[PDB]
Motif scaffolding. Structure first.
Motif, mmCIF file in Angstrom:
data_model
loop_
_atom_site.group_PDB
_atom_site.id
_atom_site.type_symbol
_atom_site.label_atom_id
_atom_site.label_comp_id
_atom_site.label_asym_id
_atom_site.label_seq_id
_atom_site.Cartn_x
_atom_site.Cartn_y
_atom_site.Cartn_z
ATOM 1 N N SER A 31 2.204 22.757 8.838
ATOM 2 C CA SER A 31 1.997 23.234 7.472
ATOM 3 C C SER A 31 1.692 22.146 6.453
ATOM 4 O O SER A 31 1.096 22.461 5.418
ATOM 5 N N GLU A 32 2.066 20.889 6.687
ATOM 6 C CA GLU A 32 1.912 19.840 5.689
ATOM 7 C C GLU A 32 0.673 18.980 5.897
ATOM 8 O O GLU A 32 0.339 18.183 5.013
ATOM 9 N N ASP A 33 -0.014 19.117 7.030
ATOM 10 C CA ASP A 33 -1.176 18.297 7.343
ATOM 11 C C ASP A 33 -2.478 19.090 7.303
ATOM 12 O O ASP A 33 -3.464 18.691 7.930
ATOM 13 N N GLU A 34 -2.499 20.206 6.578
ATOM 14 C CA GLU A 34 -3.694 21.026 6.429
ATOM 15 C C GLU A 34 -4.430 20.752 5.124
ATOM 16 O O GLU A 34 -5.360 21.490 4.782
ATOM 17 N N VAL A 35 -4.037 19.711 4.390
ATOM 18 C CA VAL A 35 -4.619 19.396 3.094
ATOM 19 C C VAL A 35 -4.987 17.915 3.100
ATOM 20 O O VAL A 35 -4.459 17.125 3.885
ATOM 21 N N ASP A 36 -5.933 17.550 2.233
ATOM 22 C CA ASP A 36 -6.462 16.192 2.211
ATOM 23 C C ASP A 36 -5.420 15.194 1.712
ATOM 24 O O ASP A 36 -4.530 15.526 0.924
ATOM 25 N N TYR A 37 -5.543 13.957 2.185
ATOM 26 C CA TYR A 37 -4.638 12.867 1.852
ATOM 27 C C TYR A 37 -5.374 11.813 1.029
ATOM 28 O O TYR A 37 -6.558 11.949 0.710
ATOM 29 N N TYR A 38 -4.653 10.745 0.690
ATOM 30 C CA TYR A 38 -5.224 9.642 -0.069
ATOM 31 C C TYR A 38 -4.521 8.350 0.320
ATOM 32 O O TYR A 38 -3.412 8.359 0.860
ATOM 33 N N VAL A 97 0.844 -1.188 0.000
ATOM 34 C CA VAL A 97 0.000 0.000 0.000
ATOM 35 C C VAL A 97 0.881 1.240 0.000
ATOM 36 O O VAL A 97 2.024 1.224 0.471
ATOM 37 N N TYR A 98 0.345 2.329 -0.544
ATOM 38 C CA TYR A 98 1.066 3.585 -0.668
ATOM 39 C C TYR A 98 0.213 4.717 -0.112
ATOM 40 O O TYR A 98 -1.013 4.620 -0.033
ATOM 41 N N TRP A 99 0.881 5.798 0.281
ATOM 42 C CA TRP A 99 0.221 6.971 0.837
ATOM 43 C C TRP A 99 0.608 8.198 0.025
ATOM 44 O O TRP A 99 1.794 8.431 -0.229
ATOM 45 N N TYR A 100 -0.395 8.977 -0.378
ATOM 46 C CA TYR A 100 -0.177 10.152 -1.207
ATOM 47 C C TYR A 100 -1.029 11.304 -0.696
ATOM 48 O O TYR A 100 -2.050 11.106 -0.032
ATOM 49 N N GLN A 101 -0.591 12.518 -1.017
ATOM 50 C CA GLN A 101 -1.350 13.728 -0.748
ATOM 51 C C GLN A 101 -1.340 14.605 -1.991
ATOM 52 O O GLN A 101 -0.448 14.499 -2.838
ATOM 53 N N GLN A 102 -2.355 15.458 -2.107
ATOM 54 C CA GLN A 102 -2.482 16.346 -3.252
ATOM 55 C C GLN A 102 -3.082 17.668 -2.806
ATOM 56 O O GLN A 102 -3.827 17.732 -1.825
ATOM 57 N N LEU A 103 -2.752 18.724 -3.543
ATOM 58 C CA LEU A 103 -3.239 20.076 -3.333
ATOM 59 C C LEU A 103 -4.265 20.440 -4.400
ATOM 60 O O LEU A 103 -4.214 19.921 -5.519
ATOM 61 N N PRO A 104 -5.225 21.314 -4.082
ATOM 62 C CA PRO A 104 -6.190 21.761 -5.101
ATOM 63 C C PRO A 104 -5.500 22.599 -6.168
ATOM 64 O O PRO A 104 -4.874 23.618 -5.867
ATOM 65 N N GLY A 105 -5.618 22.162 -7.419
ATOM 66 C CA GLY A 105 -4.958 22.831 -8.520
ATOM 67 C C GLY A 105 -3.503 22.474 -8.710
ATOM 68 O O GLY A 105 -2.832 23.102 -9.537
ATOM 69 N N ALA A 106 -2.991 21.489 -7.976
ATOM 70 C CA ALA A 106 -1.596 21.086 -8.066
ATOM 71 C C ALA A 106 -1.503 19.570 -8.162
ATOM 72 O O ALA A 106 -2.408 18.841 -7.749
ATOM 73 N N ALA A 107 -0.388 19.105 -8.722
ATOM 74 C CA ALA A 107 -0.165 17.679 -8.884
ATOM 75 C C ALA A 107 0.101 17.017 -7.530
ATOM 76 O O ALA A 107 0.667 17.639 -6.628
ATOM 77 N N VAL A 131 -8.238 16.946 6.609
ATOM 78 C CA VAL A 131 -7.551 17.251 7.858
ATOM 79 C C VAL A 131 -7.291 18.749 7.906
ATOM 80 O O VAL A 131 -6.688 19.311 6.984
ATOM 81 N N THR A 132 -7.745 19.392 8.977
ATOM 82 C CA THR A 132 -7.574 20.820 9.187
ATOM 83 C C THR A 132 -6.558 21.063 10.298
ATOM 84 O O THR A 132 -5.940 20.135 10.827
ATOM 85 N N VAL A 133 -6.389 22.335 10.651
ATOM 86 C CA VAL A 133 -5.463 22.753 11.698
ATOM 87 C C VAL A 133 -6.266 23.347 12.850
ATOM 88 O O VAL A 133 -7.210 24.118 12.637
ATOM 89 N N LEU A 134 -5.921 22.945 14.070
ATOM 90 C CA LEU A 134 -6.613 23.427 15.260
ATOM 91 C C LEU A 134 -5.695 24.317 16.093
ATOM 92 O O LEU A 134 -4.475 24.294 15.934
#
Lengths: 221, 213, 198, 50
Positions: B80-87, B33-43, B106-109
């Protein structure tokens, strides 16, 4: 380096759209490429893998006959087409690519998307291309808005005094109408003392039809 | 099909947030299994591959390991790196291809509440001579966003041709709802007054605007 | 004669057969298999040599009376981006008998507990994917190795060289070659007879 | 069977006693050493070599 994809705009259902994935820099003969779609509000969804040096073709167990791709080694690009688009299958498309070269099912255990290429999010909707119908708006700090109605496709650019006004320029999120069109209303916040001295104007831009008309907004009288 | 993944996972910084990935036996345990993250409008970018090695430029706080029929991911610290959705990337034989997760937001508290300000605007005189009436009404500066629209003209409510969307984040770091309606100018001018009735669960404000000015 | 048109070789040494004399003998039952090797264990495809590679995947029998053909491959299937086409069996329960093609997907175990699909434990996957790049000289390089097997079963010969045959001669002590059967003697008409099936 | 955890074996060629069958064999007082081979003299660890 990164990959590209030539997407399209919003289109009517039951049509054919052709995209083009063009490689850049490296000789496009050694990397296995993939495709993927990500629905708005949902996750990515796998489609298939092809190799641009041999005649190997595979699909997923949900779109075997829905899609068909073409390969051109000498032209050095890859096209794929979407036929008879529904309202749910439309998504953002990324020209995926994995390192190495293999064409076996058991090879995919050690095959991962090491690098990702940018794409586009073409979409589908049933409506005709035409200029928006702009109308003035009356205020209820005086708050007045700009009215745009029945514009296709989406989105459009609206501004006050050609973008030189910073008096609370707010852009509300787009909605969906029951007639197959779209409508928006951007409301600005201005003091009422400046309303009787200088009258602002609303500028609207429509890229596909080149209908940029300037109108005067005033209260009803 | 898609894997069952919890989309609502968050936490304050300084502790560990765990995100699990449920799958079948052929998907997890017999496959890597692999873990990836992506940004809106970015690869998307690669963070964890093969669940053993980490590439260059990836922070060491990321961790993805497999121990049974369901993999999981653990993060320490959310700056800064955990404020965007993962996959969750994996391969199986259910579709002769790979699978992807449903996205873990995942948001920031949280944010202070704001009283809503209903704004109803009558149409101008240009629509009157064109035999049309585009009723417009906006409600902004309120949080959280869960409201309903009442098309009441103090005589009889009509809900034919409602256009209301879900609330979303705006430029002022708040939520602003929208509500549109299309109606014939005769029925619009027949009513003596119009208003929009919205409430933030504790206050229902009404505005009296005369269409005849 | 088409063998020599396939680059200089790291091969053509043969055991149990003469590679120089490849046209005079006639036989049958020709079988050929193709695979790849890392390069540092080219000599491991040989009778009597047993290690890990070519013992859990394809063990050459001691009585094989055949040999392989191979040459260096730097422009055929070696890419700078990698070649993940080929795999091999890392782990096996016991020694594999020759001429047995086996397939395995299940997770090899290394403990007394049951293990069929559990990962992250001492059980390991019995397969791995090759990585072929020009940065590896001999250790990780594809090769065009093909094994050829010769069988000497009692049967009429079918495949051998294209050399022409000569006219029949009688009543002279000469040397004869009948379908690979070399013999010396004088040829006479046969008064003996049998059922016409041998 | 526990010796396979650290790393898979590379050479595996054994002279004399068969390494395949070892559970049924009985013996005593074995010697263990440890050194290095730089890579091109793996076959040099054999009797009669120079």
């Amino acid at each position: 380096v990164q990959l590209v994809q030539s997407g399209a705009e919003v289109k009517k259902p039951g049509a054919s759209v052709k995209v083009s994935c063009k490689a850049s820099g490296y000789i496009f003969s050694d990397y296995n490429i993939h495709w993927v779609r990500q629905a708005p509000g949902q996750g990515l969804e796998w489609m298939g893998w092809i190799s641009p040096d041999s005649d190997d073709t595979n699909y997923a167990q949900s779109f075997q006959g829905r899609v068909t791709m073409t390969r051109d080694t000498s032209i050095t690009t890859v096209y794929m087409e979407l036929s008879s688009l529904r309202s749910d299958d439309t998504a953002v498309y990324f020209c995926a690519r994995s390192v190495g070269y293999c064409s076996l099912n058991s090879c995919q255990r050690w095959m991962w998307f090491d690098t990702w290429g940018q794409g586009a999010l073409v979409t589908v909707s049933s409506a005709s291309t035409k200029g928006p119908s702009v109308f003035p708006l009356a205020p209820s700090t005086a708050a007045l808005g700009c009215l745009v109605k029945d514009y296709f496709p989406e989105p459009v650019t609206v501004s006050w005094n050609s973008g030189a006004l910073t008096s609370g320029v707010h852009t509300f999120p787009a909605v969906l109408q029951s007639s197959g069109l779209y409508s928006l209303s951007s409301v600005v916040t201005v003091p009422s003392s400046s309303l009787g001295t200088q009258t602002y104007i609303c500028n609207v831009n429509h890229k596909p039809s080149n209908t940029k008309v300037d109108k005067k907004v005033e209260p009803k009288s | 099909p898609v894997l069952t993944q919890p989309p609502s996972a968050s936490g304050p910084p300084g502790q560990s947030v765990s995100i699990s990935c449920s799958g079948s036996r052929s998907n997890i345990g017999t496959n890597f299994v692999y873990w990836y993250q992506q940004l809106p409008g970015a690869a998307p970018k690669l963070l964890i591959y093969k669940n053993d090695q980490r590439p260059s430029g990836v922070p060491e706080r990321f961790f993805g390991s497999k121990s049974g029929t369901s993999a999981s991911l653990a993060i320490s610290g959310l700056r800064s790196e955990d404020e965007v959705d993962y996959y969750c990337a994996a391969w199986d034989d259910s579709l002769s291809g790979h699978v992807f997760g449903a996205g873990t937001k995942v948001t920031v508290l949280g944010q202070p509440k704001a009283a809503p300000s209903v704004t109803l605007f009558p149409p101008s005189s240009e629509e009157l001579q064109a035999n049309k009436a585009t009723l417009v009404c906006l409600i902004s500066d309120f949080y959280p966003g869960a409201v309903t629209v009442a098309w009441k003209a103090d005589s009889s409510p009509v809900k034919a041709g409602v256009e209301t969307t879900t609330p979303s984040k705006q430029s002022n770091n708040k939520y602003a709802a929208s509500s549109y309606l299309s109606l014939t100018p005769e029925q619009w001018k027949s009513h003596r007054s119009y208003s929009c009735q919205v409430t933030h669960e504790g206050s229902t404000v009404e505005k009296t605007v005369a269409p005849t000015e | 004669s088409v063998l020599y048109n396939f680059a200089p070789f790291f091969a053509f040494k043969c055991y149990g057969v003469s590679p120089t004399k490849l046209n005079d003998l006639c036989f049958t039952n020709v079988y050929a298999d193709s695979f790849v090797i890392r390069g540092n264990e080219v000599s491991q495809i040989a009778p009597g040599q047993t290690g890990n590679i070519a013992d859990y995947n394809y063990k050459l029998p001691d009585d094989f009376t055949g040999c392989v053909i191979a040459w260096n491959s730097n422009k055929l299937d070696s890419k700078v981006g990698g070649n993940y086409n080929y795999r091999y069996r890392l782990f096996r329960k016991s020694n594999l008998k020759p001429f047995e093609r086996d397939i395995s997907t299940e997770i090899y175990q290394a403990g007394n507990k049951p293990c069929n699909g559990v990962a992250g434990v001492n059980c390991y996957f019995p397969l791995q994917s090759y990585g072929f790049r020009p940065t590896y000289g001999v250790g990780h390089q594809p090769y065009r190795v093909v094994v050829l097997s010769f069988e000497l079963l009692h049967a009429p010969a079918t495949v051998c060289g294209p050399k022409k045959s000569t006219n029949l001669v009688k009543n002279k002590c000469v040397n004869f070659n009948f379908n690979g059967l070399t013999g010396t003697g004088v040829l006479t008409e046969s008064n003996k007879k049998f059922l016409p099936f041998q």
